[PDB]
Design a protein around this nucleic acid. Structure first.
Lengths: 134, 258, 171, 184
RNA sequence: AUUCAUAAUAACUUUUCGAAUCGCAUGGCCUUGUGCUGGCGAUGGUUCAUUCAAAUUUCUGCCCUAUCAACUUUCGAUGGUAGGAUAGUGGCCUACCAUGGUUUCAACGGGUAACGGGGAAUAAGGGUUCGAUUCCGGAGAGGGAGCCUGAGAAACGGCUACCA
RNA sequence: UAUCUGGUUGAUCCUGCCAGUAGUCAUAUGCUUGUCUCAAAGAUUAAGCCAUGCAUGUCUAAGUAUAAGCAAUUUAUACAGUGAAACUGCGAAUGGCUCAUUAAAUCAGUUAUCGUUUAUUUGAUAGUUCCUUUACUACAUGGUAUAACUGUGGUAAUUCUAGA
């Protein structure tokens, strides 16, 4: 917004992962809260790269508020950002979504059952149904 | 043991890797490779806590599988590839090569240099013998063997490997008055212009090595590695030149030129 | 009864506990080298038997509606290129590799052959691999030979220099 | 398994609990330096004993030894940084003879009271535990800070504190509301 | 320091072997074949060019007990020769000699409410207790044994048989 | 932080213990359920027993395909997308747990392998075989079933299997 003096330091530009990673320093005295979307779009508008090219996390707020420090990385393009950013991070940002599945215990039990079952199981089910019928 | 060891924990890993005791309980174990387990630096930890290029194991492994880095002229997409002393790893992105050298205090220092030093490197001969079909050969510290060496090469010598061909461009022998590099013990990373040797027939030879400060010390023959003749080096010396200054002088020099 | 299979080769009419291994009938090894104790029925037909699996070798004169009037068709034809070529039995150069019998299946209204991958076929790619291996072997052989020759002449000139030096010395 | 995380003690209960002299003297010092508890003098005596033992085992070694020189210089540098000793005395007699009273009359709790911006050591303690005081840029809430003259150079009040402005406060706001209701 | 790594010499091999695997680029010439040629990537060697690993092994060091002074064998109980077995050393196991080995400098036997270390608690010093447990090494995965696969297991979230 | 004090006598000086005192990455227990911090945690007795559910499986551009799966095919009259199951390869001998056994046995420091190790190692392959052979004989390069599948059956029955 106005006089937010949000800065980035220790910036390194690595074409290996094709990004620019740095520590973000946010000074918001007498300000209620800065959100993840606000911070990312502000870093985007000051780095003139792209709105979704920037990704910020961490955001440890110093004791008593007023100042916060985090990590921030800007990709050269949305394609590289999607390729390199973690799936959970993309889901948290909204750039991606992972389809809900069964819980760990349930899927492990499914794997136990179909590891006990040998073969496809269609023939076994047909034989069981035939035996039940007769 | 019932089998080989496949894990390594923090605080049980060699000191020169500089692993923090928190933020995990296991250490990156280097598998079979060109260097020892202790006297080597895995690529993952090298990328993680020496250059800060990447900050995640997942990102590091992705970097390795995307073929964006290579070792000694080879990609070597191993997530825990061990690269020890005198190892050259060039980076096509900006074309910067890192030599894994030993600092004065005894840790895996990294030296960033250009394409010529990327191409040419140094190696220490471990033994020279005759193979099958009457073929003589040598053994180096990194396993970079050259076939059919010149007959002057004996044990405890150093050679220059061009990393592209199989020919030894330069060879430097073992005698008095040569620039050396002690890799082992408490003097890890010291250059001291070897003076003389006590053989002690039966093994475990001792070498008298004296730094330019006239700081003379001794080391096992198994730890010294000649890196060039007096004066000019074969490879660029790291920062500090391997001096190991006295504690009071080093502390007040830090206080002055902090 | 109770589902104990007959194992051929025991020559007894009773049930025994056999240590069955891999490649032994009435047992499949879930682990490598896992031997298992299994109760198996003997190889003599007796009252203990519940079902008897039999094969017809020669047929009679009476006909049933479920043995010759109907027959299940084969599901998959030969898969190897050599297998199909010797099943067709046309010639060595009768283009069987492309004349192989084609089976059609369709999901809805669109029909496709979806012909499978035939193996052990003579291919330009396989020929190229043969040429590349030949070339690799030959260039490696010549490189080793020339390296040996260069080392031999190096040793020869070093020996001549050493002989000249030691002849000049000790005058 | 999880790598171990080390912890240490910081105070030492004295060998005999009931001395009409030691207990009385420690009560005087706690009262006159604003110390809510006795474990605080216990821990300050623990640090004093640690530094005195370091000085003693440093002095037991012969002169000009480089280890002695380095350890003494580091100890002197730390003690000058904290500031309990005058910065123009290198005889080490004062650092070895440093007493609990001399050590305590230098920490920031006495400094604020002697400078007069709190008018009471207990009032200063309540201000610190209520967080309406910042020694420097970061707002502090712990009585035992031991400023190293950094906060002295950066003396000020906390931004979100009384006399710092930008906030009347809850009690002030309700007082103003009640006054407005009473007036009309 | 070796009978060392080696090279050769009639023979032994009953035969283990040197892409009868697959992706990716496919641009050059015509003697027309889709011929000649063009580059990389997981599979291999009966070979070494050290490495992650196992195996025994040298020298010293362990608590309390004499209410434990002698201990060690139908044919292992110390050594010599030879063989077998082992990935090889070796009484590791077999055939053939002497009475050989250990011991008051404590053998042997018993106990351990004994897994051994780094180490934990007071520190003037010298010390006295503890270490099951965050790392290393060893043993086990009900007690015993015996085994297949495997480079590596006496493997037990592998198997076989007997036993709370 | 190189410290003592109370207790035998009417009283005194003593060797002497019983106490008092202070700690425990030493426990248990009783009274207090106010707050940043990492978090010790069924070891002592019972290495005693386990009902239950989990803790070892595995893919790439680059081993074999057709659950009778998905749609573009438009480079395939043999495909180079996806490819669940099954075969092959590898792992499962790692890790985690406990301390029962164990007194020169482990273990610690230091050695020896000129007494042996070596999946994937790994640095690379190795112009040596047309064995009644200057012509039984394909090298523009051979043969069969064991699996999933099409159906049949066995018991309450098991990560059971006979089957064509």
């Amino acid at each position: 917004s106005d006089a937010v003096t949000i800065r980035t330091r220790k910036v390194i530009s690595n074409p290996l992962l094709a990004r620019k990673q740095f520590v973000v320093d946010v000074l918001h005295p007498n300000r209620a809260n800065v959100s993840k979307d606000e911070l990312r779009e502000k870093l985007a508008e000051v780095y003139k790269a792209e709105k979704d090219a920037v990704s910020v996390f961490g955001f440890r707020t110093q004791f008593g508020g007023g100042k916060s420090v985090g990590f921030g990385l800007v990709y050269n393009s949305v394609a590289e950002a999607k390729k390199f950013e973690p799936t959970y991070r993309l889901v948290r940002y909204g750039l991606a979504e992972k389809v809900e599945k069964a819980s760990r215990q349930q899927r492990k039990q499914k794997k136990n059952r179909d590891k006990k079952i040998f073969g496809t199981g269609k023939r076994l089910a047909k034989k069981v149904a035939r035996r039940n019928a007769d | 043991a019932r089998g080989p060891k496949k894990h390594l924990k923090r605080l049980a890993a060699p000191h020169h890797w500089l692993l923090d005791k928190l933020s995990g309980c296991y250490a990156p174990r280097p598998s079979a490779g060109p260097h020892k387990l202790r006297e080597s630096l895995p690529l993952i930890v090298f990328l993680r806590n020496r250059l800060k290029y990447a900050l995640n194991g997942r990102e590091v492994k992705a970097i390795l599988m995307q073929r964006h880095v290579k070792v000694d002229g080879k990609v070597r997409t191993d997530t825990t590839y061990p690269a020890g002393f005198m190892d050259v790893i060039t980076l096509d992105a900006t074309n910067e090569n890192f030599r894994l050298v030993y600092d004065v205090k005894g840790r895996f220092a990294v030296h960033r240099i250009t394409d010529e030093e990327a191409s040419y490197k140094l190696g220490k001969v471990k033994k020279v013998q005759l193979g099958k079909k009457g073929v003589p050969y040598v053994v180096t510290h990194d396993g970079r063997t050259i076939r059919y060496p010149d007959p002057n090469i004996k044990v405890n010598d150093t050679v220059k490997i061009d990393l592209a061909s199989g020919k030894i461009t330069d060879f430097i022998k073992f005698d008095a008055g040569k620039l050396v590099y002690v890799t082992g013990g408490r003097n890890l990373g010291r250059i001291g212009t070897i003076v003389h040797k006590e053989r002690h027939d039966g093994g475990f030879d001792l070498v008298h090595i004296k730094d330019s400060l006239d700081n003379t010390f001794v080391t096992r023959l198994n730890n010294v590695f000649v890196i060039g003749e007096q004066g000019k080096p074969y490879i660029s010396l790291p920062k500090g030149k391997g001096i190991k200054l006295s504690i009071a002088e080093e502390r007040d020099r830090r206080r002055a030129q902090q | 009864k109770q589902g104990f299979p007959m194992k051929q080769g025991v020559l007894l009419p009773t049930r025994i506990k056999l240590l069955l291994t891999k490649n032994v009938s009435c047992y499949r090894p879930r682990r490598d080298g896992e031997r298992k104790r299994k109760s198996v029925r003997g190889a003599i037909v007796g009252p203990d038997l519940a079902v008897l699996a039999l094969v017809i070798v020669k047929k009679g004169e009476q006909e049933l509606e479920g043995l010759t009037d109907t027959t299940v068709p084969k599901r998959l034809g030969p898969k190897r290129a050599n297998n199909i070529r010797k099943f067709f039995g046309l010639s060595k150069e009768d283009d069987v590799r492309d004349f192989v019998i084609r089976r059609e299946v369709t999901k809805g209204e669109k029909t496709y052959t979806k012909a499978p991958k035939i193996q052990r076929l003579v291919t330009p790619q396989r020929l190229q691999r043969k040429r590349h291996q030949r070339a690799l072997k030959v260039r490696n052989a010549q490189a080793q030979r020339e390296a040996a020759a260069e080392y031999a002449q190096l040793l020869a000139k070093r020996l001549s220099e050493r002989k000249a030096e030691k002849a000049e010395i000790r005058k | 398994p999880r790598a171990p995380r080390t912890y240490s003690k910081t105070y030492s209960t004295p060998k005999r609990p009931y001395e009409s002299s030691r207990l009385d003297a420690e009560l005087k010092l706690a009262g006159e330096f604003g110390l809510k508890n006795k474990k605080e003098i216990y821990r300050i005596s623990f640090q004093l004993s640690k530094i005195r033992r370091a000085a003693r085992d440093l002095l037991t070694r012969d002169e000009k030894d480089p280890k002695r020189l380095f350890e003494g210089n580091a100890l002197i540098r730390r003690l000058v940084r904290v500031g309990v000793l005058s910065e123009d005395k290198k005889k080490l007699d004062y650092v070895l003879a440093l007493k609990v009273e001399d050590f305590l009359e230098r920490r920031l709790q006495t400094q604020v009271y002697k400078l007069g911006l709190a008018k009471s050591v207990h009032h200063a303690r309540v201000l610190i535990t209520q967080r309406h005081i910042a020694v420097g840029k970061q707002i502090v809430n712990i009585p035992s800070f031991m400023v190293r003259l950094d906060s002295e150079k950066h003396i000020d009040f906390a931004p979100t504190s009384p006399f710092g402005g930008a906030r009347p406060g809850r009690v002030a706001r309700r007082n103003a509301a009640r006054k407005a209701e009473a007036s009309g």
